Amino acid sequence: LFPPQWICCDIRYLDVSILGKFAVVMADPPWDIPYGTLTDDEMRRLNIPVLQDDGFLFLWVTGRAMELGRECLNLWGYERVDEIIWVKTNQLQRIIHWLNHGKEHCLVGVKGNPQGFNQGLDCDVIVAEVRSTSHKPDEIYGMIERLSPGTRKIELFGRPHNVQPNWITLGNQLDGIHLLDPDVVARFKQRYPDGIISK
Amino acid sequence: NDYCQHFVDTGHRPQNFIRDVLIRLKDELIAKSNTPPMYLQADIEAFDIRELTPKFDVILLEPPLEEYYRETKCWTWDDIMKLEIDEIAAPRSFIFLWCGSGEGLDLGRVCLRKWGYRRCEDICWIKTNKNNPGKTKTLDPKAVFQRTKEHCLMGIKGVDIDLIITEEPEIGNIEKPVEIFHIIEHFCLGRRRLHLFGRDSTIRPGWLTVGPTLTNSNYNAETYASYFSAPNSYLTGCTEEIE
Numbered sequence A: 001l002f003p004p005q006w007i008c009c010d011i012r013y014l015d016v017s018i019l020g021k022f023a024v025v026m027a028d029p030p031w032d033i034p035y036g037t038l039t040d041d042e043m044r045r046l047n048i049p050v051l052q053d054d055g056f057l058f059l060w061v062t063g064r065a066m067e068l069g070r071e072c073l074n075l076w077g078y079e080r081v082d083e084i085i086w087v088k089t090n091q092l093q094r095i096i097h098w099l100n101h102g103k104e105h106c107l108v109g110v111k112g113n114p115q116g117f118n119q120g121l122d123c124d125v126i127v128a129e130v131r132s133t134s135h136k137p138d139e140i141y142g143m144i145e146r147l148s149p150g151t152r153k154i155e156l157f158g159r160p161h162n163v164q165p166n167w168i169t170l171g172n173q174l175d176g177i178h179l180l181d182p183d184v185v186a187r188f189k190q191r192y193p194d195g196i197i198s199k
Numbered sequence B: 001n002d003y004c005q006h007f008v009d010t011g012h013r014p015q016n017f018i019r020d021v022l023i024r025l026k027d028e029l030i031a032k033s034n035t036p037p038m039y040l041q042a043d044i045e046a047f048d049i050r051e052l053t054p055k056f057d058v059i060l061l062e063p064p065l066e067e068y069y070r071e072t073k074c075w076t077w078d079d080i081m082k083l084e085i086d087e088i089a090a091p092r093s094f095i096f097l098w099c100g101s102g103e104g105l106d107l108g109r110v111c112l113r114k115w116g117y118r119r120c121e122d123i124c125w126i127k128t129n130k131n132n133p134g135k136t137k138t139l140d141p142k143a144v145f146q147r148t149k150e151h152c153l154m155g156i157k158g159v160d161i162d163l164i165i166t167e168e169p170e171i172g173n174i175e176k177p178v179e180i181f182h183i184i185e186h187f188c189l190g191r192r193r194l195h196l197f198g199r200d201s202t203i204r205p206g207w208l209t210v211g212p213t214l215t216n217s218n219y220n221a222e223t224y225a226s227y228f229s230a231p232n233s234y235l236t237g238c239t240e241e242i243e
């Protein structure tokens, strides 16, 4: 079901096996050290492996999570095959520890044998204005749609500004549960007959 | 505007549209403090790296990767990982490792940890195509996207941005942008600086360059050591000479 869908939940406790398989996964995790974080062990323990058989993972990282994100990506069964950077500019296309930071990194991982994707349509550099702090640039969605048009996608640790057609968005600041895909709706009621997602 | 859609529409890479893309006193201090350029032709595989003394404050490592020769001895990450870099690095010292844009972003990190560093910066060399918007890209089989940048990883053991933007060099040109030296020298990390796999074309005051394609050598270990004997042992490279 094409229009946006979402589940407010503690991603730690949701049984994601109800969601089906996805052509693309994207996560922008709250890595450990305002909002709720996950420890490194919790990050590692996420059930990312059930979300795909063949497809791509997009994993935003920063600081020391550049290394820890590579660990989770490998632990969850992916090989890192690309690394996207977003060059942060102002509205006049000028660039906003040891150096000042002008970019953010998004690791790109592959699982299995993805077929029918339009690899090589975009390049690995995004140039876009910092619209709102902590927000990823909307350009990533277009890149992912050109790469895998029409397919099912899931975002972990998203926020209401993140919901998109063809995407299911998970995060704890979303507005209740809004599911439209009949296969998903069926499995959710079965798994959660009283609509409560508990530990 | 969406510059990614634009690049799909026109072939102009998004980085083409970035604009503007007393620190002169620091530079002049760097130049006064710089040792004479020193350089040595050596096949680094067959060379006991321990013959390079004393222990270096900065190491810039630029191994010639196969991926640099798209349409053209290559070192593999297997070979690079076997370099005994921790034998020549000072207990507090810095490394700058050109990792390319593929598997090197991972194996380069294995290298840094193997030699005892932790990564504190990731410097990306972003290549514009303003002069050849049409020219496409033979993609790596595993690549998902067109690769238009290279990473230089900075590691530590014991004013500037992390971006370098220049036009993509001519095919077969393997030179890295000289801006990396400015970034490095503006850190004021000490004066013993080693460039492994440098070339005649990268020799530079304040650096010892070692690599197989140098046509001449002037390296002498004792002469080299003499530049850092007391009172000059601990200079940052950004302070006045001691009278």
Ligand SMILES: CC(C)Nc1cc(N2CCC3(CC2)CN(c2ccc(CN4CCC(C)(C)CC4)cc2)CC(=O)N3)ncn1
Binding pocket: A009, A010, A011, A012, A028, A029, A030, A031, A035, A036, A037, A038, A060, A061, A062, A104, A134, A135, A136, A137, A157, A158, A159, A170, A171, A172, A173
């Ligand atoms: C309670 C917890 C145990 N369990 C959760 C938490 C959860 N969250 C928390 C996180 C969420 C969404 C809901 C995202 N977050 C956020 C902020 C910054 C970054 C960094 N990143 C770096 C790259 C970049 C610059 C391109 C964009 C920013 C990453 C994430 C802000 C926020 O407020 N909320 N959702 C379900 N379970």
